[PDB]
Design a protein around this ligand. Structure first.
Ligand SMILES: OC[C@H]1O[C@@H](O[C@H]2[C@H](O)[C@@H](O)[C@@H](O)O[C@@H]2CO)[C@H](O)[C@@H](O)[C@@H]1O
Ligand SMILES: [Mg+2]
Length: 244
């Protein structure tokens, strides 16, 4: 029932340039009832809440955390989403396989959840290892997808997950059209966002893998902003003529 569904990553997207974050929130703060806001972050819910206190993030309507593996409504965790993601998912088998790659080191326990297995790729290792990992995991027949970003972060998620799928679920939940949706990102864990039919903005300070993705799959609905961080969001809103 609103004119815009705004979905944005936090680190290096909404966050990173405090001045830009502040004028973006001031602008949005004057028409809060005109849009639904959702933060689609790689961070856990707790970590995202902590970031909110650190930089003064405005309260979103929804939180799509841990790369969309968990969705929080104003009322709490979305149990339907969790069950949907649990179907056919085999965390232990996938973990056993990933744990076997010497170039991969587990990320801290607090970065893990039932539907998210994360690692850090050795800076000295060849990125090609990610391709080998992906193929090996896929061949298990378990519906899994590999998210590689910033040249170091590796996330194993159910195929039904990732920011894009979480976004489409939210769109359906809110009866919001892709044409009324704007997704904002900066890295590989945002590619799922641009795979959707929503309008999208890639921040100027975007990571190499996202820029590479844009050069190959970039369409008319995708916008390469001149501004970095939060400034790219205001720029995109004007570009797509949202909140007319
Ligand atoms: O999906 C990629 C990784 O994202 C991580 O979010 C963080 C991190 O927690 C922050 O401290 C800051 O550095 O930005 C990162 C990128 O957004 C998440 O914690 C990892 O588990 C993910 O693999
Ligand atoms: Mg990102």
């Amino acid at each position: 029932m609103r004119q815009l569904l705004l979905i944005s990553d936090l680190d290096n997207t909404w966050v990173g340039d405090q001045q830009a974050l502040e004028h973006l929130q001031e602008y949005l703060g004057d028409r809060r009832g005109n849009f639904y806001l959702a933060y689609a972050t790689g961070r856990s819910y707790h970590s995202a809440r902590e970031l909110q206190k650190q930089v003064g993030l405005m309260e979103p309507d929804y939180w799509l955390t841990a790369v969309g593996s968990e969705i929080y409504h104003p009322e709490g965790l979305d149990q339907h989403w969790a069950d949907y993601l649990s179907e056919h998912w085999q965390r232990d088998i996938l973990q056993a396989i990933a744990d076997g790659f010497e170039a991969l080191k587990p990320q801290s326990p607090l970065e893990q959840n039932p539907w998210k297995i994360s690692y850090h790729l050795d800076p000295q290792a060849c990125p090609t290892v990610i391709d080998q990992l992906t193929e090996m995991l896929k061949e298990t027949g378990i519906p899994v997808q590999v998210i590689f970003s910033s040249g170091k972060d590796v996330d194993l998620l159910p195929q039904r997950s990732n920011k894009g799928n979480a976004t489409q679920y939210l769109q359906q939940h809110l009866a919001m059209e892709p044409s009324q949706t704007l997704v904002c990102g900066d890295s590989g864990n945002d590619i799922g966002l641009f795979e959707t039919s929503a309008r999208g903005v890639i921040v100027r300070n975007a990571q190499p893998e996202l820029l590479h993705w844009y050069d190959q799959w970039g369409d008319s609905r995708h916008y390469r902003a001149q501004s970095s961080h939060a400034g790219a969001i205001l720029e995109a809103i004007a570009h797509f003529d949202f909140l007319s």
